[PDB]
Amino acid sequence: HRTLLYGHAILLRHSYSGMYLCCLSTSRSSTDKLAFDVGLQEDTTGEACWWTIHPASKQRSEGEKVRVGDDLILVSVSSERYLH
Amino acid sequence: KGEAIRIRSILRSLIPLGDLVGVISIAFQMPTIAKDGNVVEPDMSAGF
């Protein structure tokens, strides 16, 4: 039971399917070119399934622990994009 | 270096290969020597 701290690499697992949220290399996005698609992946290995939490506003600070009800910005490690 | 592969992938996504090939294949305008053969050089401040 470690605590979420802003900037940490978090792993999100789908409770039902059992796969993990990931940034798919496929580009289905409508004329976005540099954007990817967000899906589910089985294997945990690879930076794709890992996301980094960033503070939404100036109330929170980098390295501070995350609190319930806060807003987040999730950054993919492999692609360096945001959940948009 | 994952950063290096990421940079290359980003640049490849930005610029398709076919676009570069086509721009390289775009033709030029060469000077002509007509009407007594005086050199008619196209202006370069407007040209390709």
Swiss-Prot record, chain B:
List the source organism: Homo sapiens (Human)
The subcellular location is: Sarcoplasmic reticulum membrane
Give the shown range, full length included: 2413 to 2460 of 4967
Name this protein carries in UniProt: Ryanodine receptor 2
Tissue specificity comment: Detected in heart muscle (at protein level). Heart muscle, brain (cerebellum and hippocampus) and placenta.
What does the UniProt induction comment state?
By TGFB1.
Give the family from UniProt.
Answer: Belongs to the ryanodine receptor (TC 1.A.3.1) family. RYR2 subfamily.
Modified how: Channel activity is modulated by phosphorylation. Phosphorylation is increased in failing heart, leading to calcium leaks and increased cytoplasmic Ca(2+) levels.
- The gene name on file is RYR2
Give the record's disease field.
Answer: Ventricular tachycardia, catecholaminergic polymorphic, 1, with or without atrial dysfunction and/or dilated cardiomyopathy: An arrhythmogenic disorder characterized by stress-induced, bidirectional ventricular tachycardia that may degenerate into cardiac arrest and cause sudden death. Patients present with recurrent syncope, seizures, or sudden death after physical activity or emotional stress. CPVT1 inheritance is autosomal dominant.
Q: Any idea what job this protein has?
A: Cytosolic calcium-activated calcium channel that mediates the release of Ca(2+) from the sarcoplasmic reticulum into the cytosol and thereby plays a key role in triggering cardiac muscle contraction. Aberrant channel activation can lead to cardiac arrhythmia. In cardiac myocytes, calcium release is triggered by increased Ca(2+) cytosolic levels due to activation of the L-type calcium channel CACNA1C. The calcium channel activity is modulated by formation of heterotetramers with RYR3. Required for cellular calcium ion homeostasis. Required for embryonic heart development.
Q: How does it assemble?
A: Homotetramer. Can also form heterotetramers with RYR1 and RYR3. Interacts with FKBP1A and FKBP1B; these interactions may stabilize the channel in its closed state and prevent Ca(2+) leaks. Interacts with CALM and S100A1; these interactions regulate channel activity. Identified in a complex composed of RYR2, FKBP1B, PKA catalytic subunit, PRKAR2A, AKAP6, and the protein phosphatases PP2A and PP1. Interacts directly with FKBP1B, PKA, PP1 and PP2A. Interacts with SELENON. In cardiac muscles, identified in a complex, composed of FSD2, CMYA5 and RYR2.
Lineage top rank: taxon: Eukaryota
What does UniProt say about this protein's domains?
A: The calcium release channel activity resides in the C-terminal region while the remaining part of the protein resides in the cytoplasm.
